[PDB]
Each structure stands twice: as C-alpha cells, then as structure tokens.
C-alpha cells in the first residue's frame, strides 16, 4: 500500500515538473511499461497456488497499471481520477490483507487449497473476503468498477486507444482467479475440506479494521460524488 502510494506520488512530480519538453519521449515510455504491467502481472496470477504470491501478482503486478493509465494521458483533467483510484485501492487491498492475516493466524496455512468450506465454519469472514475480492475484480455495484470506469472515461477522452482496451481485457482476464478462490469458499463436500478449516474456533482490533475497511470497498463506489468534487483541485 504505502510503497505504491509514495512512489506514485513522487513519480508524477519528478516527471511533470522538470520534464515539460520530453513528454512525447516518456509518455510513450511509461506506456510500454503499462501495456506490459497489466499483462505479465495477470497471466502468472492465474497459475498461482499461494495466496500472498497471487496477491503480489494480481493486486500489485497488475493493479499498478491503470493508475499509470492516466499519468501518460494527463492534461490536469485526470489527476483527480488517479487520486480517487488510489483511495479505492488502499481500502479494497487492506480489506483482503486483513482477512488473510486473520485466517492465516487462526489456522496456520497460506496455500489456496485450504480455504475450502470456510463459508460454513465462519461465514462473516468468508463474506468480508469475497466482497473485497469481487471489488478487486471490478464488478458494477462495488467500488473497483467505478474506479476503473472513471480511470478509462478520462483516458479514452484523451485520445489514446490501445491502452483502455487492453485494460478492460486484462480486467476480464483477472476475473478468473478471483472467481476461482470465491468458488473454493462456497462448498459443502465434507470429505474434501482438509483438517485445517475443520478445527477452527471462530470467535477488537483486527475485526474492527477488517469490518471498517470492507464497507469502504462498497459504499464509496456509489458515493464517489463528494470524493470526485474534492479530487479536482490538484495543480502540481
């Protein structure tokens, strides 16, 4: 979260203030990164079996794509969209990390194949993880959808076409592993669930963080009006 925030805060200033002239020679350059960042950070994400490594691939290897997706296409009419997407991403990422920390501590495993049946043992955690994962997927009523949307709508409004299409396509592609782990949550084949979720004494701090970070992954996507009105006053 904070490395990406700080790096993206330093990059725009270090590239916009002292590099007026070289635009046409770095606008392209960053693009070459983005078109790769949202591809190689997704394909591998499919084949993963560990949760932390899959999160590294998806939530970082890719999602550091559409943030950049306007730094190239910016006439100061887009920076608001970067701020809004960062505000969405922080929450929609800390939610799933809180859920992962909680389940890992409560059980002692990381690999995907142990999240089976978790909906039946403790349904609240499974639900609050599915919500954040789907939001990361970018589905309409959630927040990630509106994030990606206002990121494209300002970025298609700036001419460049062979970056929005790739973004939407790789988002569709990214839906796969999200729905895979979601499918692994909802199940009841008692003879399949490993003896990890089977011994789970279900049940302060981590609960509070997870529950106040997950509703901010559903409400702002529909309440983005004041956030948008606030993010438009950025001149740097």
């Amino acid at each position: 979260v904070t490395s990406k925030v700080a790096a993206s805060a330093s990059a725009t200033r270090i590239l916009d203030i002292p590099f007026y002239f070289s635009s046409n020679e770095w606008h392209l350059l960053l693009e070459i990164l983005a078109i790769l960042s949202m591809i190689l950070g997704n394909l591998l994400a499919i084949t993963q079996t560990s949760m932390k490594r899959m999160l590294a691939y998806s939530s970082i290897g890719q999602i550091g794509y559409v943030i950049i997706g306007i730094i190239v296409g910016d006439s100061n009419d887009g920076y608001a969209s970067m701020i809004t997407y960062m505000l969405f991403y922080i929450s929609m990422n800390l939610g799933t990390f809180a859920c992962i920390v909680l389940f890992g501590l409560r059980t002692g495993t990381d690999n995907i194949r142990d999240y089976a049946g978790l909906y039946m043992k403790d349904p609240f955690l499974a639900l609050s993880l599915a919500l954040c994962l789907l939001s990361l997927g970018g589905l309409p009523p959630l927040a990630g959808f509106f994030g990606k949307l206002y990121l494209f709508w300002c970025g298609w409004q700036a001419g460049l076409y062979f970056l929005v299409s790739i973004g939407l396509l790789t988002s569709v592609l990214s839906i796969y592993y999200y729905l895979k782990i979601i499918k692994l949550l909802m199940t009841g084949r008692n003879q399949e669930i490993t003896p990890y979720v089977r011994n789970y004494r279900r049940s302060n701090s981590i609960e509070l963080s997870m529950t106040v970070c997950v509703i901010a992954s559903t409400i702002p996507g529909i309440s983005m009006n004041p956030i948008l009105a606030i993010a438009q006053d950025t001149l740097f």
Partner: peptide
C-alpha cells in the same frame, strides 16, 4: 459450464462498454 459462461459474458460486455465510452464523450 459456470466459468465458461461468466468469462464469456463478461468478455462480451467489453465491446458494450466500448460503445458506452464512444457515444458518451
């Protein structure tokens, strides 16, 4: 069946969103 259906429909809706962005601006 479920995964083919969801991937296929979500992919199909991409061109719809393209048209949205096209005639919205």
């Amino acid at each position: 069946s479920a995964t083919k259906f969801i991937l296929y429909t979500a992919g199909g809706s991409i061109f719809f969103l393209i048209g949205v962005l096209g005639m919205g601006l």
